[PDB]
Design an enzyme around this catalytic site. Sequence first.
Site, PDB file in Angstrom:
ATOM      1  N   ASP A 137      -7.876 -15.165 -21.253  1.00 50.47           N
ATOM      2  CA  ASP A 137      -7.771 -15.966 -22.471  1.00 50.47           C
ATOM      3  C   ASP A 137      -8.835 -15.534 -23.473  1.00 50.47           C
ATOM      4  O   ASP A 137      -9.413 -16.363 -24.183  1.00 50.47           O
ATOM      5  CB  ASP A 137      -7.880 -17.468 -22.166  1.00 50.47           C
ATOM      6  CG  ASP A 137      -7.269 -18.352 -23.257  1.00 50.47           C
ATOM      7  OD1 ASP A 137      -6.469 -17.851 -24.079  1.00 50.47           O
ATOM      8  OD2 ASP A 137      -7.594 -19.563 -23.286  1.00 50.47           O
TER       9      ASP A 137
ATOM     10  N   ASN B 256     -12.607 -18.270 -28.174  1.00 49.55           N
ATOM     11  CA  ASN B 256     -13.332 -18.415 -26.914  1.00 49.55           C
ATOM     12  C   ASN B 256     -14.595 -17.566 -26.855  1.00 49.55           C
ATOM     13  O   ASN B 256     -15.169 -17.386 -25.772  1.00 49.55           O
ATOM     14  CB  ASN B 256     -12.407 -18.118 -25.728  1.00 49.55           C
ATOM     15  CG  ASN B 256     -11.374 -19.208 -25.522  1.00 49.55           C
ATOM     16  OD1 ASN B 256     -11.581 -20.349 -25.942  1.00 49.55           O
ATOM     17  ND2 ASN B 256     -10.263 -18.873 -24.866  1.00 49.55           N
TER      18      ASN B 256
ATOM     19  N   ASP C  90     -14.405 -21.124 -22.018  1.00 51.04           N
ATOM     20  CA  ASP C  90     -13.031 -21.492 -21.696  1.00 51.04           C
ATOM     21  C   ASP C  90     -12.427 -20.674 -20.563  1.00 51.04           C
ATOM     22  O   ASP C  90     -11.565 -19.809 -20.785  1.00 51.04           O
ATOM     23  CB  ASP C  90     -12.108 -21.481 -22.911  1.00 51.04           C
ATOM     24  CG  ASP C  90     -10.816 -22.222 -22.641  1.00 51.04           C
ATOM     25  OD1 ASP C  90     -10.548 -22.514 -21.452  1.00 51.04           O
ATOM     26  OD2 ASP C  90     -10.086 -22.536 -23.606  1.00 51.04           O
TER      27      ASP C  90
HETATM   28  C1  P5O Z   1     -14.806 -25.119 -31.735  1.00 51.21           C
HETATM   29  O1  P5O Z   1     -13.447 -25.431 -31.403  1.00 51.21           O
HETATM   30  C2  P5O Z   1     -13.296 -25.700 -30.072  1.00 51.21           C
HETATM   31  C3  P5O Z   1     -14.323 -25.526 -29.151  1.00 51.21           C
HETATM   32  C4  P5O Z   1     -14.095 -25.824 -27.811  1.00 51.21           C
HETATM   33  C5  P5O Z   1     -15.116 -25.648 -26.883  1.00 51.21           C
HETATM   34  C6  P5O Z   1     -16.549 -25.687 -27.435  1.00 51.21           C
HETATM   35  C7  P5O Z   1     -17.522 -25.503 -26.460  1.00 51.21           C
HETATM   36  C8  P5O Z   1     -17.106 -25.181 -25.176  1.00 51.21           C
HETATM   37  C9  P5O Z   1     -18.028 -24.989 -24.164  1.00 51.21           C
HETATM   38  O2  P5O Z   1     -17.616 -24.671 -22.909  1.00 51.21           O
HETATM   39  C10 P5O Z   1     -19.381 -25.115 -24.431  1.00 51.21           C
HETATM   40  C11 P5O Z   1     -19.806 -25.440 -25.706  1.00 51.21           C
HETATM   41  O3  P5O Z   1     -21.137 -25.554 -25.919  1.00 51.21           O
HETATM   42  C12 P5O Z   1     -18.881 -25.634 -26.739  1.00 51.21           C
HETATM   43  C13 P5O Z   1     -12.848 -26.298 -27.399  1.00 51.21           C
HETATM   44  C14 P5O Z   1     -11.819 -26.476 -28.322  1.00 51.21           C
HETATM   45  C15 P5O Z   1     -12.052 -26.171 -29.660  1.00 51.21           C
HETATM   46  O4  P5O Z   1     -11.098 -26.327 -30.625  1.00 51.21           O
END
Ligand code: P5O
Length: 275
Positions: A137, A142, A159
């Site tokens: 992915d 990501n 992710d």
């Molecule tokens: C920014 O948009 C998105 C960010 C994320 C994940 C952010 C994130 C994930 C982590 O595993 C750790 C962290 O510090 C931040 C998920 C969906 C989104 O739409």
Amino acid sequence: TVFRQENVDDYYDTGEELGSGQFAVVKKCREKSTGLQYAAKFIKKRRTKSSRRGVSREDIEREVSILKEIQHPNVITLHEVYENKTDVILILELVAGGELFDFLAEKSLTEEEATEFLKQILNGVYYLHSLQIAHFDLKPENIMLLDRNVPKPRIKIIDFGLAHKIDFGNEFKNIFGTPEFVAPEIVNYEPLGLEADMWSIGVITYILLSGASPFLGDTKQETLANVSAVNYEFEDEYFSNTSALAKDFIRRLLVKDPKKRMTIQDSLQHPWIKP
Ligand SMILES: COc1cc(/C=C/c2cc(O)cc(O)c2)ccc1O
């Protein structure tokens, strides 16, 4: 495998929402006992065995098991896992500098800027592939930065929701990633291995250098058809001052036959990358 079933809110305070997806939401959080800050990823559980809403426990446990193995500067690390009847809650390293994608829309990068990011991506993927972990992915969404305000930020791959251990060289499962970034073998529902990530890196590299997506069509089916046919080219308007060696690197990743595609080790020895 069972996770901590105490209420997460007794040990963490949540704050700003960092993102939300189909079955998950990520919220900034702070551990009460240490004051340390994390990202809490709430993953909605499936509520019946035959349902299509939520994430199956098999899929959640696989992501957790993979996250528990990895420790590398360019990959997110897992702190703790909680669960209740509705969600599994991964307490993950906080990566607060935003997406490589959102940082992309603000600028097209120079080759030095691109390779400085790309080298960190390659280092993280070299670590994963060394452990026989396919991410499956990889896309700008990501790839996130620790601090987006320095001339050369440090990136972390996030992710691991589609990641799989590849202990037999390939895995035969459907990977529903996003069309613009998936390899032809994913589009064609063929056995999948580490090579699929290398294709995704080629797409990411093309976008980093040009600001344009190499296979993007007007509909998802068009994009998938373009991927399967390897229907892309370097538009002179976008690539006219890009080096031929950068194009060569991309061309050796955007290869339909996975066996002929550059591996992660190949990519690190390629003359565009190798110091
Ligand atoms: C920014 O948009 C998105 C960010 C994320 C994940 C952010 C994130 C994930 C982590 O595993 C750790 C962290 O510090 C931040 C998920 C969906 C989104 O739409």
